[PDB]
C-alpha cells in the first residue's frame, strides 16, 4: 500500500478548475479535487451564475463505468441531480450514513418516501422505500421540471452498516450489497455510469469502486484469472487521486475478493 502511497508524492495531472475562486464552497476538502481530463463538467446552468459546470466528480472507467464524487454539500444538491441526469444514471451508491462520528459526511438530498421535492430544474418523486439488513433501496423518479417526458427511475442503493471506525470485520455486506447494484445495473438497458459516493468520494468510494470493478473481473473470467489489486488501484487513481486512503481499506479488497471467489 506504501508503494502506492508514495508513488502519488507528486500528481502526474491537472485539477486547475476546482482550484478556481468561485468553485472553492463547492468541495468539501480543500485538498481532495478532480484531475480536469476525467472530472464531471455540468452543461446547462444557472445563466445567472459565472461556474455552473463544476462538481468534483470523476468519471471511473476500467481500462461499467462509474461516478465518484463527494457527498452532496446544501448548495451542491442541485448540481448533483444536474449530474445525474445529464449523465443518465440509473443507480446511486450511497456508503456513507448522513453524519457519521457526529459530523455531516452527506447532505439529504433525496425526499422522503411518497414525497416529491424540486432542485433547481430536477423534480425527484421517492416512490418507494425498502430497507433489507444492510442497506436501504430507495426507488426514485428523476425528472426535469417543464418536461415530465424526460422522467426515469434511479434506484439509491444506501449502504447503511459500515462502521464509524475502520472497515467491516467481514466483507459479506458489501458483496450481497455489490451484487444487487450489479443486477439491477445490469437490467436497465443503457443505464449511464454508476456513482457512488462518500464524505471526501475516494477513500471508502473508491474500496468500492475497486472491489467491484475486481468482482467483475471474476464474473467473466471465473475463479482462476489474475487479479492485481495494486495495478488497478493506480488504474483508478489516474482518473481520480487518492482512491483508497487506508491499509485496512486495501486488506478488505483483498478480503472481499478472496470470499467472493469463496461464495462462486
Ligand atoms: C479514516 N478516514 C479519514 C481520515 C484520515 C485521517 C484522519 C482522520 N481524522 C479523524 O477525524 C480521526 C481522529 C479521531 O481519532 N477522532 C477524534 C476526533 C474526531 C473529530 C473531531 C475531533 C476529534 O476533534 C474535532 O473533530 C480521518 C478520511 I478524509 C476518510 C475518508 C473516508 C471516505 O470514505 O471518504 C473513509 O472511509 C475513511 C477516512
Known sequence: FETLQQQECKLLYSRKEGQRQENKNKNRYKNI??????????????????VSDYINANIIMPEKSYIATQGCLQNTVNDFWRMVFQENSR???????????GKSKCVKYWPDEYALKEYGVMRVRNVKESAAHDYTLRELKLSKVGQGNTERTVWQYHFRTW???????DPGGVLDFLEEVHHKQESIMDAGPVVVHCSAGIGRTGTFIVID???DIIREKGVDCDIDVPKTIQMVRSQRSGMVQTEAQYRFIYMAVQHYIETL
Request: net charge negative.
Open 33 to 50: 479535487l478532480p484531475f480536469d481530463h476525467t472530472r464531471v463538467v455540468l452543461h446547462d446552468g444557472d445563466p445567472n451564475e459565472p
Open 213 to 215: 470493478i475486481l468482482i
Open 163 to 169: 462502521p464509524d471506525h475502520g472497515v467491516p470485520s
Open 91 to 101: 443507480v446511486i451508491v450511497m456508503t456513507t450514513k448522513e453524519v457519521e462520528r
